[PDB]
């Protein structure tokens, strides 16, 4: 769940990759199913939306039993897991996943060639902003990171809802394409980490579950301020929490070699400089030709 100990239970079940993938909350029927689940579990709706700290302590104590009793029915039996929790005296607890999410949020949204340099240097500064937060004397940075993580998750959820509702994910025998060209949150999708967050969100929902074949997904986002696409080549994933022989074998990501070959053949000023080869930057006028070349490559 997403920031269970720093938000409301309803929000924890709402802004979650696995929960949404299992229940497909992006449509109204998913929200109705979630409401029915909460009603069956016995937790009221007003109580479920109260912050974790101020929520009634009885339900907080009995939560594990409630989850065990009433989650098999809705298929969310893989939600339960064992994780590390670190708490300092008289201060609220925090789990490893929440700490990592806060650190990533601080890295992402915390705070011609000139714009590129400014963006990269802002990311470098955010690196140090995150570095300090990793200490026990800088709890304020941790709280700010948690708030920023909440905001980023809300924005990514909204964008994913829009994409899924409008059915922008075209399907091809080899790969799947999702190109963004408008929206209110397109500014955020310039940091590779945020774009990868959106990619993971989309991969979990209907690309790894819902009886769908596993194909690499190419996700791109425009930025009119520089006229280029932050194309990212993501790898598929097997259903979460399903141990099997095929699950043991890692799913290799073949985007790097095909990307390099296509860049070598053509000339579109592709910026292959990120350490992760999955991400490049292609000019606006040369996106569709590059996609056609990738389709013809047959190397994915």
């Amino acid at each position: 769940l997403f920031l269970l100990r720093h938000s409301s239970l309803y929000d924890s079940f709402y802004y979650s990759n696995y929960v949404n993938a299992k229940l497909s909350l992006w449509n109204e029927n998913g929200k109705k199913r979630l409401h029915k689940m909460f009603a069956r579990m016995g937790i009221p709706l007003s109580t479920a939306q109260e912050t974790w700290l101020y929520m009634d302590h009885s339900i907080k104590r009995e939560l594990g039993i409630i989850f065990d009793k009433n989650l098999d029915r809705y298929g969310l039996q893989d939600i339960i897991r064992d994780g590390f929790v670190r708490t300092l005296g008289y201060r609220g607890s925090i789990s490893a996943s929440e700490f990592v999410e806060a650190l990533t949020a601080l890295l992402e949204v915390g705070n011609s060639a000139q714009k590129l340099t400014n963006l990269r240097k802002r990311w470098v500064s955010n690196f140090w902003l995150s570095w300090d937060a990793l200490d026990d004397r800088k709890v304020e940075l941790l709280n700010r990171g948690i708030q920023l993580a909440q905001d980023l998750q809300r924005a990514i959820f909204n964008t994913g809802v829009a994409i899924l509702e409008k059915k922008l994910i075209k399907h091809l025998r080899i790969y799947r394409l999702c190109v963004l060209q408008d929206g209110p949150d397109l500014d955020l999708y310039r940091n590779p980490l945020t774009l990868l967050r959106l990619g993971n969100w989309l991969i979990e929902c209907c690309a790894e579950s819902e009886d769908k074949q596993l194909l690499p997904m190419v996700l791109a986002s425009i930025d009119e301020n520089t006229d280029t696409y932050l194309v990212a080549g993501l790898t598929p994933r097997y259903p979460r929490g399903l141990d099997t022989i095929h699950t043991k074998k890692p799913i290799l990501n073949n985007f790097s070699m095909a990307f390099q070959q296509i860049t070598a053949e053509t000339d579109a000023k592709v910026r292959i400089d990120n350490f992760e080869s999955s991400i490049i930057e292609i000019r606006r006028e040369d996106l569709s030709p590059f996609l056609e070349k990738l389709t013809l490559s047959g190397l994915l």
Binding site: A39, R40, M41, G42, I43, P44
Partner: peptide
Amino acid sequence: HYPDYARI
């Protein structure tokens, strides 16, 4: 249908 509805 909802065994624990008495709480709500």
